[PDB]
């Protein structure tokens, strides 16, 4: 029981993943940032708009094979110094 | 609200030094399916003069949904802060699933938090009165945002209910010049958005001013830690 999941960035790119339905999604998330040269803290993973946590499993979030995960950048106006 | 010495203390602890990634509150908490979270880094965006980030905003909007239910206030649906840019950029099909298992048209008030180039603003969709209003603490107009939002409602309704809206019975408002601006600080734009949403969700006239924000930021750190609005 591997499941394929699509991860869709805001720049239009799409990285596919085959993963165990009970593996924590953190494995997926780390591979994704490393590959895209992204900083974990600056990005959010969402499944139909809802938080996916490192500790979450695809089965626990009831994803189905072929499903799409979004990654968004953080939203913050400014930087206080 | 003048705060307790213990309140002060716990708030100062949540904002002070420690691991940025340390998770300070989750809703619902472990074990629950994901699961909004606030780490120390996110809750620090409530320090005075700092800009709030999406994680504070979404966590607070969501406490308003819970509070409204507990108090007999109107049925509230809040969209993610990621919902609007995704709908703007990619159309209805891109967000249709973001209401799975919910009948949007059986709620009474819908809040759409909007992150614009550098500041937060809010769209309120009042289903009781078929009205959309754009509230923006820097006094920007959002009749464009509103029309994109209204189109989404017709698209939801046709898809989920197989019925059509009559978009002529629906109307946009932007606030008039003195219905609470502050452009002096877009730092407080996220706090204005969250307080706008808190009052609007209760049918309460919006009477707070810029002077209250620093206290509101401290209150909100305790509200978030305790998942309970004061």
Curated annotation (Swiss-Prot), chain A:
Its main location: nucleus. Residues 1-80 form the Ubiquitin-like domain. Polymeric SUMO2 chains undergo 'Lys-6'-, 'Lys-11'-, 'Lys-48'- and 'Lys-63'-linked polyubiquitination by RNF4. Cleavage of precursor form by SENP1 or SENP2 is necessary for function. Disulfide bonds: none annotated. Residues 79-80 form a propeptide. One of its GO terms (molecular function) is protein tag activity. It is found in: Nucleus; Nucleus, PML body. Keywords: Acetylation, Host-virus interaction, Isopeptide bond, Nucleus, Ubl conjugation, Ubl conjugation pathway. Broadly expressed. Changing residue 20 to E: Significantly impairs sumoylation of MTA1. There is a cross-link at residue 6 (Glycyl lysine isopeptide (Lys-Gly) (interchain with G-Cter in SUMO2)). One of its GO terms (biological process) is protein sumoylation. There is a cross-link at residue 78 (Glycyl lysine isopeptide (Gly-Lys) (interchain with K-? in acceptor proteins)). One of its GO terms (cellular component) is GABA-ergic synapse. Ubiquitin-like protein that can be covalently attached to proteins as a monomer or as a lysine-linked polymer. Covalent attachment via an isopeptide bond to its substrates requires prior activation by the E1 complex SAE1-SAE2 and linkage to the E2 enzyme UBE2I, and can be promoted by an E3 ligase such as PIAS1-4, RANBP2, CBX4 or ZNF451. This post-translational modification on lysine residues of proteins plays a crucial role in a number of cellular processes such as nuclear transport, DNA replication and repair, mitosis and signal transduction. Belongs to the ubiquitin family. SUMO subfamily. Interacts with SAE2 and UBE2I. Interacts with ZNF451. Identified in a complex with ZNF451 and UBE2I/UBC9, where one ZNF451 interacts with one UBE2I/UBC9 and two SUMO2 chains, one bound to the UBE2I/UBC9 active site and the other to another region of the same UBE2I/UBC9 molecule. Covalently attached to a number of proteins. Interacts with PELP1. Interacts with USP25; the interaction sumoylates USP25. Interacts with SIMC1, CASP8AP2, RNF111 and SOBP (via SIM domains). Interacts with MTA1. Interacts with HINT1. (Microbial infection) Interacts with Epstein-barr virus BGLF4. This is Small ubiquitin-related modifier 2. It comes from Homo sapiens. The lineage of its organism: Eukaryota, Metazoa, Chordata, Craniata, Vertebrata. The gene is SUMO2. The chain holds residues 16 to 95 of 95 of the full protein.
Curated annotation (Swiss-Prot), chain B:
Belongs to the peptidase C48 family. The active site is at 119, 136, 189 (nucleophile). The N-terminus is necessary and sufficient for nuclear envelope targeting. Residues 37-201 are annotated as: Protease. It is found in: Nucleus, Nuclear pore complex; Nucleus membrane; Cytoplasm. Binds to SUMO2 and SUMO3. Interacts with the C-terminal domain of NUP153 via its N-terminus. Interacts with MTA1. It comes from Homo sapiens (Human). It comes from the Eukaryota. Protease that catalyzes two essential functions in the SUMO pathway. The first is the hydrolysis of an alpha-linked peptide bond at the C-terminal end of the small ubiquitin-like modifier (SUMO) propeptides, SUMO1, SUMO2 and SUMO3 leading to the mature form of the proteins. The second is the deconjugation of SUMO1, SUMO2 and SUMO3 from targeted proteins, by cleaving an epsilon-linked peptide bond between the C-terminal glycine of the mature SUMO and the lysine epsilon-amino group of the target protein. May down-regulate CTNNB1 levels and thereby modulate the Wnt pathway. Polyubiquitinated; which leads to proteasomal degradation. Coiled coil: none annotated. This is Sentrin-specific protease 2.
């Amino acid at each position: 029981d591997h499941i394929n999941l699509k991860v869709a960035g805001q720049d239009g790119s799409v990285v596919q993943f085959k993963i165990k339905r009970h593996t924590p999604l953190s494995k997926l998330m780390k591979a994704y940032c490393e590959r895209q040269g992204l900083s974990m803290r600056q990005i959010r993973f969402r499944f139909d708009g809802q938080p996916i946590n490192e500790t979450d499993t695809p089965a626990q979030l009831e994803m189905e094979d072929e499903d799409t995960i979004d990654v968004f950048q953080q939203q913050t106006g400014g930087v206080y110094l | 609200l003048e705060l307790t010495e213990d309140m002060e203390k716990e708030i100062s602890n949540a904002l002070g030094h420690g691991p940025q990634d340390e998770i300070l509150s989750s809703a619902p908490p472990p074990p629950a399916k994901g699961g909004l979270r606030i780490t120390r880094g996110d809750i620090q965006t409530l320090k005075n003069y700092h800009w709030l980030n999406d994680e504070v905003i979404n966590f607070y909007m969501n406490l308003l949904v819970e509070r409204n239910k507990k108090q007999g206030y109107p049925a509230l649906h809040v969209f993610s802060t990621f919902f609007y840019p995704k709908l703007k950029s990619g159309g209805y099909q891109a967000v249709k699933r973001w209401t799975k298992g919910v009948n949007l048209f059986e709620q009474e008030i819908i809040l759409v938090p909007i992150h614009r180039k550098v500041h937060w603003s809010l769209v309120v969709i009042d289903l009781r009165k078929k009205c959309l209003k754009y509230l923006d603490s820097m006094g920007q107009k959002g009749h464009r945002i509103c029309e994109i939002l209204l189109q989404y409602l017709q698209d939801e309704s046709k898809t989920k209910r197989n019925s059509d809206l009559n978009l002529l019975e629906w109307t946009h408002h932007s606030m008039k010049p003195h219905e609470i601006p502050q452009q002096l600080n877009g730092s407080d734009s996220g706090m204005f958005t969250c307080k706008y949403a808190d009052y609007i969700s209760r049918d309460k006239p919006i009477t707070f001013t810029q002077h209250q924000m620093p206290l509101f930021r401290k209150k909100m750190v305790w509200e978030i830690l305790h998942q309970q609005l004061l």
